[PDB]
Every structure is written in structure tokens, then in C-alpha cells.
């Protein structure tokens, strides 16, 4: 195998950012004139360019497709992908054969971006242009929210004929369903996306393939980043090759109407081969034959439908809904508006992160909405009383720290989804997770925490009240203060109140299941279904929390000694006196009086026999990789020194503070 | 991965601030200068003698192991680009741990932790291992030259990086470390008067190879151990030979033995005396082997190679010369990659500057203030020198910096001196001999009639004229800006300049000046990436420097390759806003060359280009930065970004600041 890659933790560093450090995305994209931007984009779509002549004299459909391909790489498994930082500029995404001829679109949008510059990120534009194109044709969309930041280096990572080159509609139905289920799109949403997105535009296959050149990443230097140069005929325009199929779906390819489902359910479809050798479907009995317009103004075309678009006619659970839409268009417009809004905004986070004047004024359950604050927040003079009340409630530091971490470690920095906001660790999909230990001391902790707000709120000075979501994090901070005060350090953990409490109706139990950690390395948990070893999954978890190598190291080192790991297992607790935040985990695995040997009862744990032969410690794979990996052993030796205890405690407090406030986008 | 030989921009942010646990307000220079060094030597000495069970010491002394570890840490220096050596952050990280001849050094860095844990953040790992070697050397009868702390350690591996048949091999190996014949002879002889190799077992296969490589696949539980099936106590690492009869003391015994008896027999790997053995040497635990079954791998070339044997046979009866020469050679070896003498800290550093450090005279006059700088700036702007001449001269003097080993830079004033004034890239047939002449006249006229004891040095004038140029160009573009200038450089002389040691600093290909010499391994773009990595420039600083130097007239030989502007010698972002111009169609020039030409303004040619200054519009990750600086509102930000990058690269070698 290959050694673990610590460069994944410090991805997208500051030195690669041309905008500097004093740059605020929201503070500027909240100031543009969206009407002016709409005018600029609308005059970019309708003016043809000789480098890529526009079909029908409208670049709209190209921009809709670019917006779909930008946001169509989201994965609910891991969260990475989607619009996000707009990675279809750098990554393999710009060189995939699936993304053919989308470099041209991003090139055509340069005149818009040139005018605005730093106050309009690429990620917005390639997702806004499409959303404007979809509205330029007469489909009143649902709303748009700017605010997805631009990034400066790539990351780590369905056939038009259906299966692997086999034209079959019923067989492509399951492929479409499975590839759209990874985006978390039910049958209605995926049918609406396929029907709506194909009422516009055409397919580009006018010439035989094998004449196009290489992708942008392996293209000649003089093409300026535009791969897939075609040598067929003129090369571009009427002779453009992008996927090798020549399908034009509707007779109105630059206007929204119910002309897709009427063609699909109107003719009988028979199989035929594209001019470039691809499989497609054409109307049987020569029906049509000169009804669909030609982009450059030549002779008309017989009706033609792709191999996967016919699925919506043979799959019963697609056929039912699409036939209903054929009898009811306004439902199709509604479903497509909502599905498109979900598609381009799925990996963007809480509602408090959308910007601009187009953002809708309603809560959609797929956003995991949390209520707005209905009272003045708890003041600093009053979090002291509440902190003391928590510290004198009989709850051990282990229980409080474990509960606070369990609440606030379900965050996905890739998806901005999860976190401690909303107070969902009390709710059904999350109180029952195995790592959280629904048994034991989570119901007890939650009860003794919500019997504290029940007393504080009733006997409160004015309108000031505290929410449960704040109470779990405040208990974590109180426990850390109590622990550090036992190691001799008098510190205060920073705490910014404001979290609210989400009821059960606003929590989608089905949605909050991919958030479940199959392996949380900080709590020393390793469930089944893990693809990689333990240390790699800890590294992945740390990357998701947007943690760096020093923060991850100090966090695990302090979190073992604080006693917040799975089932209170004594794995990696390298301290004699627990319930105290000290330096002991680092200074005890650098000890060379201890010889680490795998446990004879093979279960993936190691036991470090002392000098005299007695077993002193008992680590695990996650714990011992810090003493083994050279570039993590380098970091352990920083906190394992003799003078670096106060530095360690302040670094742990900083990392804990960073983790608790990951989800706080409202402040 | 899927795109091998793609432009790897990840090299420009090596060792970021994210991965540094010490923070940003941590300066190692002010930390290590406060440690007690006598306490450090006492701690190291108590570590060396006190053997530990997991790696027992030969003769009860870890000295020779620490000497060997310090040699191997500092023995990877490459004169080609300076990378390697004991610069901190190499020997303890992924490539150099698992490494066939770094055998026992994995359990020789963890042997010093009882000291690093005592001192912690105020003593780096590189400083610790090299100083451990030096103190081990000094605790076994030898008196070294000196020592200087300051090797700040990095937190990330660098993505970059029998009879006489052995004489030429070791000669080449030590020649590509910048070591001449006397220094390499002294280094080998001195280093092999200390210790043995180790014991031996059946073979390297059945022994130190249970997936034995510390980081690749050693396995957890054995965090660093070339484990052996033999015992690893007294016999280890699978090669047995001891050179001198006193392996823990400096005296003339290596080459008294070597010149004592013949070695025609090779046992199993050089025997002794052709069956004249005995008990001259001493073993580690007890017993005693033959009379020096020594001279490993037939590296007695010091007695066979005709030019080694001369100096070596001289050292047979003149041990003082060997002592002194080994002192100087060792001091050079462990301090080669550390830079100017202003960078050495601590109380051990000797007050004697050698010619290999590129010495620069210390300041004797008073530095120019904020009024004399303005007066000189005006005097040098109104002096008949164009912006292109001033900018290309200032960039020529300060782009000769090798950030890997901090050698070169604008300080020293050596562009007026022979090794640099005659380089092809510093086009001497052009204006260099004229620009330096008029700047010399300026300084003579200035400090001849100076106010008080304030004087200006030539090394200051080249840089100041560089700043007085881009100020004029920016003012001729609507943006009046002030370029920071820190006086303090002093100018060297040809006596302190090593002509044959600066040949390695010659730019084989400079991308910012659009130079490309014959004999380039990689294309013109990867050479630019290497150049900017050597200058310690991020990616945006690369981009802004290239786009400024193009339009600002700094091209090699004033070639109009990449001047995508019509306003001559003015600081604008016309390079970016015209490189992204999609109205022109690039194509290789009909001359079978590496130059392009973007025609189709209408149907005519304009804006000749090249691979260096056209990959910016091609590479997506660089296309992003160009689109940042080529926007409509980016005109005033590009000016200040260029000024910041220019200031960074001019003050790049300023360690005396
Ligand atoms: C199973 C699902 C889908 C398949 C197999 C599919 C496949 C394709 C293919 C092969 C093309 C031709 C590309 C070209 O010729 O340049 C195309 C074009 C297009 N697709 Fe899709 N697509 C799917 C879903 C979607 C979705 C969800 C949307 C929008 C939300 C969409 C919008 C478009 C548009 C507007 C075009 C026209 C592009 C142009 O005119 O250049 N498609 N699709
Ligand atoms: C062509 C030049 C050299 C060659 C081929 C060479 C080779 C070797 C080899 C094979 C070993 C055995 C290591 C072991 O058994 O663990 C060794 C050890 C050693 N080397 Fe060198 N070496 C060279 C130059 C030097 C230099 C320049 C120094 C400078 C200090 C040095 C210092 C040492 C010392 C002190 C040891 C003893 C290691 C111990 O006691 O564990 N050698 N060398």
C-alpha cells in the first residue's frame, strides 16, 4: 500500500490565494447589482462567437448543461463534489469525456466575470449563468443564492446509451435511478430533472468521432485550455462533436413548454445509429420527418430521442409520473423548479449562508432548517452562572465532553452539513447512532442538561433564555475548564451563544443517515463497512472537519486523556490520573521504555509491555500511528516536550473552539 | 496521477503555515540564541555514554554513531541546486528514513530525545543532530572549528528531491558536494578514525529485512527498527569491519595502519597483511579480531589513487595538518547549506569568515535615511537610464538567489564582479557594463559630497535603481506608489568572490527574463517552476512577477516575446488582460522554433509569444490567477501586488536586517 498523505489536511492553503487574507466573500458578493449581472449574462448568451458559434443563436442550453454538470457531481456518501468551490475548472473534471465542450462555456462567460472580478466568484457564475439561462427562456425559477467561495487547487476524488454501451431503456432505468440516488433525488425529482433539462437544446454529433483531439489537460499549449479540438469540417458550430450523438429533443429548443413529453409519448421509437456511431432512437414509420428545427437554419430533422430519455416511458415508476405530467404541465414546472433549486444549492450549507436578493423566503426540509432566535442571547455574566450550574450537576467531565463532541463532530466541511447547531443530538436519527451510544450515558446526559434550561429559563432576569443546542456546547466548555483547572491551568474556553433547537418535524431521518460516522478516530470507534484502515479514516474525518495536522494531533491527544472515547475503552488513555487535561498522551507514547507488540488475542489492538514485562499501556492502530508516522511523530514531539504544557492546553482550547464553531455561519 | 508530467503547482506552497505547529509569531532565531550551550553539551555527553537497552552502544559510547548520523544528514547536499544537506526537515522524513544506507540512523535520532524533550521548541531537530555529531567529535579528543545554530526545521517532506575504480567514484561523489581533493581526503580519513561499522549476520535478507524500512512498510509496534532475526545486540546491520585500534579517540592510526601493511587479500570486504593478522584492534563486547581486518569495500584508494596518496602520505608524519584540515572540512560539511554568516547564532560561531561562505564586508558608514534615499532616487531616475535597463539590472543581481541553501542574492554587489557580469543571461554585450558604470559614477558623486558620515554602496544602488524604475513606470500608469527600500547591503570584491564556485549559480534558464539556454532537461515551463520554487515564491507571486516583468521591459535581449502591451515601460496589467483576450488565435510560429504567434486581430500577426509566457493562459490553475489579475477592477491591486513581490524578492537574502 501507500503511506498516509498528510498533505490532504492543509489543502487550499492561504499562500495559494491571490486575494490575500483580508478577503471576505460575502461582504462583496452582497453588493453587486443582480439586475446588471442578469443584463450582462443575457447579452452574453445571445451574441454568437466565431470560436464557438451558438446553436439557434442562443447559448442558453449550453449554460444549463454546464450548470447541471457543475452540480451533478455531488455525492451523499462523502459530501464532496457539487457546485461548492467550482472545481470543474481545475480538476480532472475539466478533462473528463463527460464534460466535453464545457471549457467553451466557461470561456464564453469570461466577459461577464471580467466586468465584476473579485466580487463574483466563478463558482457562482457557472451556477448563476445556467440559472439565468433557464429564466431567459420563460421558466420562472425558484430563486438563487450567491455565496459559494472560489478555490485555487483541485481535490481528491451516466452513459447516454444506458449500460456500458448497450442501448436498452428498461436497463438504463436502474442506472439512472442509482446514479441520481447518490445525489439524494427521489423518482419525482429525477424525472423532473431529466424532462425539464431536455426541453432545451440538442446533442452534438454531426461528425464521426476519432477526429477530435485530446482533452484540455493533454492539449497543445497554443489551444489556451480548450481541448477536444475537432478537425471535422469547420470543426465548430454545425460540425461540432461533443458526445457523438445527434439528438434534438423538441421543436422549440430555446423555449420552455410541454414539448418533450408530447413528442416522447407521441411517436413510436425504433433504434438507429448516429453519424458518429452511437445508439439513439428515432420516430418509427418516418413520422415527423422535417418538424424539428436545424440550429444553423438548414433542412428540418426527424424527431429523435436519446437512449436514456426513453427510459421515462418504459420504467413503470417513471412512466406513471411522466404520464401524469403529460396531462398536467404546471406540476412539471413546479417539480422542476424545486428540483433545480435543490440541485444547484445542495452542497452550500445552512440557509444563513445564501446571499443576494434572489434567495427565497421559505424553509425547505432538505436544508435541515433551524428556528431563528426568538429572544436576546445569554450574556457573558450569565453563562458564568450556567457554566457553574453545569459543573455542579454531577456530570463527569468525560460525559459532558463526549456529549459535546458527539453533537459537534457530525459536521461535513465539504457539504457544510451537520454540526452542533439545531441541537439534533437529542433527535431521532442522531441519538440512536452506535458511536453516540444511545444506551449508557447519553439519555442521562441529555436529561440532566435539559432539566437545567428548564430551570434557568423559568427563573431568568428578563427575556433571556438558553437553548439546548447551546447547553451541550456550554457543558463541553465547562468540562474542559474544570479539567484544565485540575492540571494547574486557569483558562476559559471561548463560547459564543446563539444556537437554536430544531424539532423532530424539521429533521429528515432519511437524510441524516449518511452523516453517521462509520469510523470516528477521535473517539476510537471503528465500525464495519470501513474501506481503509483505521488511521486513513481518522485522516479523512479530520479532513472533513476542516482540521489541520497540528489541530488534529492536539485534539486526539487531549481528547483521549479527557476520557471521551467509545465505551470508555482504555485504549490510548496513556495517563494514570484521568479527568484532567494534561500533556500525558504525547509524553507517554514517545517513551522508549515501552515495547509495543500486537495483542495475542488478535483484534487490532496493541499492548505496550513495560520494562519489567508487566503490561503498562494498551493502544490501538489510530493511537500508535502518531508514534510511528515520521511526520506525525514530528508533531507529537512538539507537545510532548517538557516546557510545552501551557502551549498544549492553549492549542487544545483553540482546536476545540474551532470545532464547536464550525457550523456557525449565522455569526 | 492520471496526467503524468503535468505542471505540479503544489511545489510552490511547500511547508505552508497550516502544517507548522509552532504558529506564525514563532521565530527560531530569537529562541535558540537564548539556550545555554554548556548545559546542552553536558546533556548530550550524558546521552552518548549512557547506553540504552533497545540499541546498545559499542564500547559504551554512542559517539561514532552520532558522528555518522551528522555526516549522513549533511552529506546529501547537491551543488546543482543546493537542495539537501542538514537544512532541517529532510533526514527525519519520508524519503530519507527508509533508505538502504541510512540503516541504523532510524534508531539514532530517537536516541537524542532525552535532550530535545528538555529543550523543546528552542532547539530544532537539525541543530540537535548536527550539534550531537559535533559534540561527539569534540568529546573524543578532537577540537573542532566552531558551530552555529539556526537550522530551522520544516514540517513536510520536500516534494522536490575495486582498487582504483572506487577512487574516481568517491571523487565524483565528493565533487558534487563542493569538496576538493584535500577536503575529501581529510574528511574520509578523519571520519574513519572514529568507531567501527558494526557486526554482521548471515545476510541483509534474513536479517534487517522483515519489511525493514522505517516509513514505507515497517509496521506499527516497531515504530523505527530494521529488525533482525539474529539479536541486534552486538552484531547488526550485516557488515563487519573496524579500522583503528582505538575506535573512540582521535589519533593518527587509520593511515598508520593503512600505510603499515599490504592488503592484497580480500576476505568476506578487505583482509589484512596477506596473512599477517593478530589482535591489534579491539571488539565491542569482548575478544578481539585480526590485525585490522579493515579498509572496507576497498576504499583504501587513498593509498592507490596517485593524487590522494600524495597528500595522504604527507599526513603520515604531519598529523597537525590532518587535524587542521579535517577541522575545516568538517565545519564546511555541516555548515555548507546554511547561508550567510549573519545567519549563524549561538556563542560557538568563530570570528573568522572563510571564502566559501561568500563573505560580505561589514558596514562601516552610516546607512542612508529617508531623505538621502529620496534624493538618490531622483538622481538615479534623472540619469539617462531607461526603465528596462534599471529593472533588468536589479532583477539580474537579485534573481541569482538559491533559496534552498540561501546562496546568492543582491547583497554583496557581485553583479559588477567577474563570475556574474559575464553570464549570458546578464547580457554583457548590452547595457550591464554601462548601467553599472553610471551607477558607480552616481555613488562616487553622492558620497564624495555626502552629509556627514552617510554613504551608499553599489549593492544598494542597483536595488534602489530597480525601485526607482518601477516607481517611475507605475507613476506613468496612473498609480503613484512607493516601493519599500531597506538600506544596509555592502559590496564585495573579487578577492572574496570564488569564480569557480558561482558557476553553479548561473541560470541555465530564467523564465522571468524569458531566457532559455541550450541544454535544458525539462521544457521551458518546468524550468520556470523550478526557478520560482528556488526564489521561494508562491503561485500568485510567480504570476504577478512574470506579468510585470514582461510589460516592464525586462526581457532577455529586449525580445518582444510576451510583451502583450502597446504602452512601453509602464506598469499595467496588459499582459493578463491581453493574454486572456480570446480574439486572437495562437499557433506555433512558421520558423520551427519554440515561439508562438497570436494572429487574427483581423488577419494579421501580433503578440509573438513563447512557452513560458503562454502557459499562464493555458494551465487551468494559472489561468485562474491570470483571470484574477486581468479583471477590470484589478488595475490598482496588481500594482501593489507587484510591488509586494518585488520587495520580497529584493530583500530575499537580507538576513542582517
Ligand atoms: C440520465 C440523465 C442525463 C443524461 C443521460 C444526459 C445526457 C446528455 C447528453 C449525452 C447530452 C448531449 C451533450 C452534447 O451533445 O453536448 C445532454 C445535453 C443536455 N443536457 Fe443532459 N443528461 C442527463 C440529465 C440532464 C439534466 C438533469 C439536465 C438539467 C438539469 C440536463 C440538461 C441538458 C441540456 C440543457 C443539454 C443540452 C446541451 C447543449 O445543447 O449543448 N441533462 N445531456
Ligand atoms: C566514500 C566515502 C565513505 C564511504 C564509502 C563510507 C561508508 C561507510 C559505511 C559502509 C559505514 C558502515 C555503517 C554501518 O556499518 O552501520 C560507515 C560508517 C561510518 N562512517 Fe563512513 N563512509 C564514507 C565517508 C565518511 C565520512 C566523510 C565520514 C565523516 C564523519 C564518515 C563517518 C563514518 C563513521 C564515524 C562511521 C561509523 C558508524 C558507526 O560507528 O556506527 N564516513 N561509513
XYZ file of C-alpha atoms in Angstrom, chain B residues 509-511 514-516 520 522-529 610-612:
18
model
C 17.094 29.024 -17.891
C 15.479 32.137 -16.415
C 11.766 32.329 -17.092
C 12.368 34.791 -20.950
C 15.790 33.185 -21.249
C 16.375 29.609 -22.380
C 17.632 22.211 -20.784
C 12.790 19.917 -18.972
C 10.692 22.251 -21.138
C 10.749 25.986 -20.606
C 7.748 25.898 -18.259
C 9.066 23.400 -15.700
C 12.307 25.373 -15.578
C 10.296 28.459 -14.622
C 8.525 26.462 -11.924
C 6.706 31.682 -26.019
C 6.142 28.596 -23.899
C 6.999 30.338 -20.619
